Amino acid sequence: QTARKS
Amino acid sequence: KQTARKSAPRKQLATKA
Amino acid sequence: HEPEFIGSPVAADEARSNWPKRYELKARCHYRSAKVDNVVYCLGDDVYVKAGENEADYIGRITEFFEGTDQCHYFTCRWFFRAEDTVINSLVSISVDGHKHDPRRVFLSEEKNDNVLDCIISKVKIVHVDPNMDPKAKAQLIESCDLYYDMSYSVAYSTFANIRTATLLDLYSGCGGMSTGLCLGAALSGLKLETRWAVDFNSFACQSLKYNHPQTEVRNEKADEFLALLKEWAVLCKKYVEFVVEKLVGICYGGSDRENGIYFKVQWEGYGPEEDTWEPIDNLSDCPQKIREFVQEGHKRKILPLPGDVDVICGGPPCQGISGFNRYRNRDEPLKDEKNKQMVTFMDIVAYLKPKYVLMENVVDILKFADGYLGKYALSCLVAMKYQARLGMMVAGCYGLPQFRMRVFLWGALSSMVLPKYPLPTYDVVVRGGAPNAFSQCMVAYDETQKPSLKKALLLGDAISDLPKVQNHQPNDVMEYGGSPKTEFQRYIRLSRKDMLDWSFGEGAGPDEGKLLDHQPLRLNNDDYERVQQIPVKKGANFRDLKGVRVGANNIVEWDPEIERVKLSSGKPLVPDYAMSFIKGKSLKPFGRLWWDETVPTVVTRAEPHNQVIIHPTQARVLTIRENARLQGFPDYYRLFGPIKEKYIQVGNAVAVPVARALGYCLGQAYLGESEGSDPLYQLPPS
DNA sequence: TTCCTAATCTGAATTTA
DNA sequence: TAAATTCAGATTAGGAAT
Ligand SMILES: Nc1ncnc2c1ncn2[C@@H]1O[C@H](CSCC[C@H](N)C(=O)O)[C@@H](O)[C@H]1O
């Protein structure tokens, strides 16, 4: 879906 | 009046004793 | 006023048929009721008795009313134990996640005493409470009296007792010898006890446990992190709720190089597993459906247990901060070292999960360090949680091992279950060590009056005469046995998985069938290597056999004046100075050679020859990892992983798997419902 | 009763790759 | 800074001598 890579 | 009182086989792990 | 006896005496021979040996105190006759200070007490009354100065008033139940042959007026009662009257003592003031010891909760015992009627004070209403009744039908009953008891206490093994799959959580699991033994013994007893979860903050121990148990969910983390992860896995199981994802791998709370909170491992679309990344939840907020899928399928697969999903919890919390080996311990307060507080964390997780059975294991100094503060703490945490409990001390060599490892084991069982016994010794042992005087009654052993013929005490040759020779540098994790097994113990230790009822790999032979695993010793540096080379191959040989060493007055080592300081090839002395200083210069341990007929009291995590006798009897090396695991009963197929030192640590911290296996058989018998009665000891069947 | 002695899932300070 | 090497305390149970 959608998220962050830090 | 006075006080009352409130009061063991050994184990054996070795072959003898 | 004078205490008096009330009513006609019991029939002369009826009193003898009820109390034969009373007719070492003899009685003229028996009665039924007695008055003291204008209150009549009948038989069976619960009574308060005057005790010593500063001592709380004793609590008893009257069993006879008789006039003594010395013309005195006696009564006799069997005592109720307060929670602090038991071995718990000062730790009656502790609380674990809410639960405290109820001041009105006593424990009936069969300990009896005779006193005079003048010791009696006033009646007390003590009701017997069934834990398996309606939970709110016990409330008003408890508040309708003065004291109450739901359990009996026995001095023998500190027993708190009542009046087919099963899941196991292994906390501080290590390489997994304890849980493996428990599962093996339970399978022998007819119970499918598996290990669903295992937590350990050492990575190589996790590697070993998952290798020998592929289906086990092994987590490389800490126990407090695991407990918080369970707490914040429950609410996701209740809610069911830069790049793009394909699936979520795992979940965690906190950890190394991370802050408190729930994190997910993420597999990103178009990227390999090497690019999978641990991420927080507030940064995964745009990924709701995949978190839903993860939570749902992990709940259906029970990757993490909810309260009620764990039937047995076993634990071997760190003893490095409790052992008599640690000369830096803090007796003044034991719950300062974190490794000591890990037992509190363990019992907190037990409180959160509420398993049917609990088995904590530690060493004997937990009953001696800080006068046993921590050990009793454990018992208290079980008693304050209404757990049936039991405490035992078991010697490893008594179950088929050439080593004398006395370990303390705390059984706990919910009141809906049967408290499991302790297995009697199946072997004789070479007694090397002393049990504490305050816990003499907690030694799991046969009494002196009766002991059947047990199998001969295993010696070291029975364990290692099979194995082929290896040098100081043995870099091979897998090799072959030089020949067939020689002794019965070696034949038992070379049994396959299915022959040992190990169902970890299902049917069909698993990995490393018939291979010799981890037969590698600690590679000593060149200096220690040639020091070992200089030790003679003889019984009793140690550093005192080196050049320039002498035994002076009162068995104290000195240097030989006629022989100059013997020097090694490196320019460092052949005989080290710490060898000369150790144990005020009176130790035989440094660079000691062990022999085939003498046992090893306790295998430890460090395998250096420096302050122990760990040198192989005929080879110029220390005992290999496989040999130490054999001394602790590990089956030969149980493969270890990691550096040689880490494998040594794994097998040295473990539980002797024969001990855990006997415990697992007892646990299975208690779990299925096959039990004899009140006896805390159990004789094992042929196994 | 004397001393010893044996025994304790090892840890920390220092020195050296 | 990490890795390797060197040294090391506090109790307590039992065991032989006498
Ligand atoms: N804070 C902590 N959190 C989790 N595990 C810890 C810990 N401190 C120590 N441990 C782990 O506790 C383990 C105790 S060893 C227990 C081995 C096991 N009973 C067996 O029979 O094989 C060690 O392996 C250690 O890595």
CA distance linking residue C124 with residue C129, whole number of Å: 16
> Given an 8 Å threshold on Cβ–Cβ distance, is B15 in contact with C457?
yes
What residue of B is the nearest CA neighbor of C429?
Answer: B14
b/e burial code for range A1-6 (CB count within 10 A of at least 16 → b): eebbee
Distances (CA, A) of C64 to C19, C107, C499: 8, 20, 57
Task: Return positions of chain D under 7 A from a protein CB.
Answer: 4-12
Instruction: Examine the fold and report which residue of C300, C325, C344 is the final residue of a domain before the chain moves on.
Output: C300
Q: Which pair of tokens denotes residue C301?
A: 């697969």
Q: DSSP secondary structure string, C535-576?
A: S-SSTT--GGGSTTEEE-GGG-EEE-TTS---B-TTSSBSS-
| Pairing verdict, β C613-615 and C592-593 | parallel
Indicate yes or no: strand E within 7 A of the C-beta of C530.
no
Q: Identify the CATH number of the domain in which residue C75 sits.
A: 2.30.30.490
Phi and psi of C650, rounded to 5°? Answer: -60, -50
Domain-embedded: residue C160: no
Residues 260-299 in C having a C-beta less than 7 A from any atom of strand E are none
Contacts with C528 (C-beta within 8 Å, 6 or more apart), sequence order: C608, C609, C610
Closest CA relative to residue C278, chosen from C299, C256, C306, C293? C256
C312 with C394, same domain: the answer is yes
Q: How far is the CA of C152 from the centre of ligand 1 (A)?
A: 33
C201 with C117, same domain: the answer is no
- Is the torsion defined by CA of C489, C491, C494, C496 positive or negative? negative
Contacts with C98 (C-beta within 8 Å, 6 or more apart), sequence order: none
Q: Mutate which of C361, C605, C653, C657 to test ligand 1's pocket (most atoms within 8 Å of Cβ)?
A: C653
DSSP state of C96: B
Contacts with C231 (C-beta within 8 Å, 6 or more apart), sequence order: C352
Q: Which pair of tokens denotes residue C379?
A: 């018992």
Q: Which pair of tokens denotes residue C136?
A: 């709110």
Q: How far is the CA of C205 from the centre of ligand 1 (A)?
A: 8
Contacts with C238 (C-beta within 8 Å, 6 or more apart), sequence order: none
Domain-embedded: residue C609: yes
Contact C393, C444 (CB under 8 A): yes
Which residue bears the tokens 């911290």? C653
CA C306 to chain centre: 24
CA distance linking residue B17 with residue B9, whole number of Å: 13
Closest residue CA from atom 9 of ligand 1: C318
The 3-state DSSP class for residue C272 equals coil
C262-266 contact pairs (CB < 8 A, 24+): C262/C229, C262/C232, C262/C236, C264/C291, C264/C294, C266/A3
Contacts with C11 (C-beta within 8 Å, 6 or more apart), sequence order: none
C345 with C273, same domain: the answer is no
Q: How far is the CA of C317 from the centre of ligand 1 (A)?
A: 6
DSSP state of C483: S
Task: Considering all nucleic acid strands, name the nucleotide whose C1' atom is nearest to the C-alpha of residue C576.
Answer: E6
Contacts with C377 (C-beta within 8 Å, 6 or more apart), sequence order: C91, C94, C343, C344
Q: Which pair of tokens denotes residue C331?
A: 């007796």
C209 with C342, same domain: the answer is yes
Cα dihedral C183, C184, C188, C189 in deg (nearest 10): -30
Count of other CB atoms within 10 angstroms of residue C647: 28
C195 with C330, same domain: the answer is yes
Contact C241, C285 (CB under 8 A): no
Q: Which pair of tokens denotes residue C26?
A: 């003899």
Beta strands in C225-276 (DSSP E): 245-253, 262-268
| Pairing verdict, β C147-149 and C312-315 | unpaired
Domain-embedded: residue C116: yes
DSSP state of C201: S
Count of other CB atoms within 10 angstroms of residue C641: 20
Q: Which pair of tokens denotes residue C568?
A: 């090694």
Count of other CB atoms within 10 angstroms of residue C401: 28
Q: Which residue is nearest to nucleotide D6 (CA to C1')?
A: C433
d(CA C142, C1' D13) / Å: 59
> Given an 8 Å threshold on Cβ–Cβ distance, is C244 in contact with A2?
yes
Residues 312-351 in C having a C-beta less than 7 A from any atom of strand E are 324-327, 329, 331
CA distance linking residue C211 with residue C288, whole number of Å: 34
Angle at C68 between CA C62 and CA C71, to 5 degrees: 130
Contact C648, C522 (CB under 8 A): yes
Q: Which pair of tokens denotes residue C430?
A: 């070479």
Q: Identify the CATH number of the domain in which residue C171 sits.
A: 3.40.50.150
Q: Which pair of tokens denotes residue C679?
A: 């006896």
Tell me the nearest-neighbour CA distance from A6 into chain C, angstroms. 7
Contacts with C561 (C-beta within 8 Å, 6 or more apart), sequence order: none
Contact C369, C319 (CB under 8 A): no
Distances (CA, A) of C60 to C34, C89, C150: 15, 19, 16
CA distance linking residue C174 with residue C572, whole number of Å: 37
DSSP state of C273: G
Residues 411-450 in C having a C-beta less than 7 A from any atom of strand E are 431, 434-438
Residues 580-639 in C having a C-beta less than 7 A from any atom of strand E are 581-582, 608, 610-611
C40 with C97, same domain: the answer is yes
Count of other CB atoms within 10 angstroms of residue C380: 26
Chains that touch C (3 or more CB pairs under 8 A): A, B
CA distance linking residue C38 with residue C6, whole number of Å: 12
Phi and psi of C296, rounded to 5°? Answer: -65, -50
Side-chain-side CA neighbours of C657 within 13 Å: the count stands at 26
The domain total for chain C is: 4
Q: Identify the CATH number of the domain in which residue C279 sits.
A: 2.40.50.40
Contact C544, C576 (CB under 8 A): no
Neighbouring-strand partners of residue C41: C34
What residue of C is the nearest CA neighbor of B12?
Answer: C448
Domain-embedded: residue C456: no
C403 with C542, same domain: the answer is no
C442 with C503, same domain: the answer is no
Q: Has C287 been annotated as catalytic?
A: no
DSSP state of C105: B
CA distance linking residue C232 with residue C239, whole number of Å: 11
- C593: part of which helix (H) or strand (E)? strand C592-593
The 3-state DSSP class for residue C100 equals coil
Q: Which pair of tokens denotes residue C422?
A: 């302790």
> Which amino acid appears at position C373 of this protein?
Y
CA distance linking residue C93 with residue C181, whole number of Å: 35
C289 with C318, same domain: the answer is no
The 3-state DSSP class for residue C40 equals strand
CA distance linking residue C178 with residue C164, whole number of Å: 21
Instruction: Examine the fold and report which residue of C154, C178, C200 is the final residue of a domain before the chain moves on.
Output: C154
Give the pocket of ligand 1 (CB within 6 Å): C 172-178, 200-202, 205, 222-223, 316, 318, 339, 342, 653-655
CA distance linking residue C11 with residue C221, whole number of Å: 70
CA distance linking residue C17 with residue C23, whole number of Å: 10
CA distance linking residue C596 with residue C458, whole number of Å: 10
- C667: part of which helix (H) or strand (E)? helix C657-672
Domain membership of residue C150 as a residue range: 4-154
Closest residue CA from atom 26 of ligand 1: C202
A4 contacts in chain C (CB < 8 Å): 242-243, 279, 283-284
Residues 63-82 of C with CB under 8 A from B: 79
Q: Choose, out of B6, B13, B16, the residue to mutate when testing the contact with C (most C CBs < 10 Å).
A: B13
Neighbouring-strand partners of residue C192: C165
DSSP state of C5: E
C214 with C329, same domain: the answer is yes
CA C143 to chain centre: 37
Terminal-residue alpha carbon distance, chain C: 66
Contact C431, B11 (CB under 8 A): no
Q: DSSP secondary structure string, C11-37?
A: PHHHHHHHSSTT----EEEEESEEESS
Q: Which pair of tokens denotes residue C101?
A: 């010891």
Q: How far is the CA of C417 from the centre of ligand 1 (A)?
A: 28
Q: Mutate which of C168, C169, C171, C173 to test ligand 1's pocket (most atoms within 8 Å of Cβ)?
A: C173
Closest CA relative to residue C170, chosen from C453, C361, C9? C361
Which residue bears the tokens 């071997």? C316
> Which amino acid appears at position C135 of this protein?
P
CA distance linking residue C439 with residue C35, whole number of Å: 40
Phi and psi of C192, rounded to 5°? Answer: -85, 70
CA C122 to chain centre: 43
The resolution in Å comes to 2.7
Contact C128, C149 (CB under 8 A): yes
DSSP state of C389: E
> Given an 8 Å threshold on Cβ–Cβ distance, is A5 in contact with C277?
yes
Domain-embedded: residue C159: no
Count of other CB atoms within 10 angstroms of residue C522: 22
C425 contacts in chain B (CB < 8 Å): 13
Contact C200, C176 (CB under 8 A): no
Contacts with C543 (C-beta within 8 Å, 6 or more apart), sequence order: C531, C535, C549, C575, C579, C590, C591, C592
C279 contacts in chain A (CB < 8 Å): 3-4, 6
Q: How far is the CA of C180 from the centre of ligand 1 (A)?
A: 15
Of C58, C449, C456, the CB nearest to B9: C449
Domain-embedded: residue C362: yes
CA distance linking residue C491 with residue C329, whole number of Å: 42
B14 contacts in chain C (CB < 8 Å): 428-431, 457
Contact C103, C85 (CB under 8 A): no
Domain-embedded: residue C444: yes
Q: Which pair of tokens denotes residue C69?
A: 């042959």
Neighbouring-strand partners of residue C593: C615
C119 contacts in chain B (CB < 8 Å): 1-4
Closest CA relative to residue C66, chosen from C126, C22, C103, C11? C22
DSSP state of C9: P
DSSP state of C588: S
Domain-embedded: residue C330: yes
Angle at C76 between CA C71 and CA C82, to 5 degrees: 145
Q: H helices then E strands: how many in chain C?
A: 15, 34
Helix ranges (H only) for C67-220 are: 139-142, 177-189, 203-212
Q: Which pair of tokens denotes residue C313?
A: 């919890």
- Give me the catalytic one of C77, C119, C175, C319: C319
Contact C312, C167 (CB under 8 A): yes
Q: Identify the CATH number of the domain in which residue C589 sits.
A: 3.90.120.10
| Pairing verdict, β B11-12 and C446-447 | antiparallel
Contacts with C217 (C-beta within 8 Å, 6 or more apart), sequence order: C196, C197, C198, C303, C304
Question: Quick one: three-class SS letters along C49-88?
Answer: ECCCCCCCCEEEEEEEEEEECCCCEEEEEEEEECCCCCCC
C213 with C237, same domain: the answer is no
Helix ranges (H only) for C323-403 are: 338-353, 373-383
C200 with C337, same domain: the answer is yes
Query: How many A/C residue pairs have CB atoms within 8 Å?
Result: 35
Phi and psi of C542, rounded to 5°? Answer: -155, -160
CA distance linking residue C4 with residue C80, whole number of Å: 25
Indicate yes or no: strand E within 7 A of the C-beta of C102.
no
Contact C217, C644 (CB under 8 A): no
Contact C163, C152 (CB under 8 A): yes
Which strand ranges, in their side-by-side order, compose the sheet holding C4-6? C4-6, C33-35, C40-42
Distances (CA, A) of C545 to C585, C589, C596: 14, 12, 19
Closest CA relative to residue C126, chosen from C40, C37, C47, C65? C47
Q: Which pair of tokens denotes residue C685?
A: 């069947």
Exposed, middle or buried: residue C570 (CB in 10 Å: 0-12, 13-18, 19+)? exposed
Contacts with C70 (C-beta within 8 Å, 6 or more apart), sequence order: none
Contact C441, C155 (CB under 8 A): yes
* Count of positions (residues) in chain A: 6
Which residue bears the tokens 């304050």? C384
DSSP state of C604: -
Neighbouring-strand partners of residue C35: C4, C40
- C625: part of which helix (H) or strand (E)? helix C625-631
Distances (CA, A) of C481 to C467, C516, C567, C620: 6, 6, 38, 19
Closest CA relative to residue C549, chosen from C560, C541, C538, C540? C560
Beta strands in C284-425 (DSSP E): 312-315, 357-363, 388-395, 406-413, 422-423
